[PDB]
Amino acid sequence: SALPQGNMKATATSEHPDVGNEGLAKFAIDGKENTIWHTKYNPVEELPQSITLELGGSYEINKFTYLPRSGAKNGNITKYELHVSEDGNNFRKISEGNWDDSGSLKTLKFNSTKATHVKLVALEGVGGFASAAELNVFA
């Protein structure tokens, strides 16, 4: 089941300031589909950029979901890696691939692994931005 988002802390390598529904990292874990993390723009901080969720404990995780922004496409992530850490500093890759640029929920299912942190790396995204409406981590 999804770990409680209110026990997590989101940080990112790049985040746009709060201009309403974007683009602070914490907007990716607020349970609100209208608010999004978005990489910093004006000017762009180029991809790759990433968002890390500190989980609020060390959990055996097996699924991750990425919900894109709704009603528009800038930052819809189309090439990704998923990494995990048990110390907040040293990361290891557990998933990688391509996603379509539609607003559909994107789900990753993987070998059970122990993590205190999960990092979603946007290698490519629509417009060269990365964005995320909601991220969930399942244990």
Ligand SMILES: OC[C@H]1O[C@@H](O)[C@H](O)[C@@H](O)[C@H]1O
């Ligand atoms: O310049 C980048 C910006 O483009 C806007 O059109 C969009 O609504 C923002 O979310 C951001 O992607």
Ligand SMILES: [Ca+2]
């Ligand atoms: Ca949100």
Ligand code: NA
């Ligand atoms: Na343990």
Ligand code: NA
């Ligand atoms: Na394997």
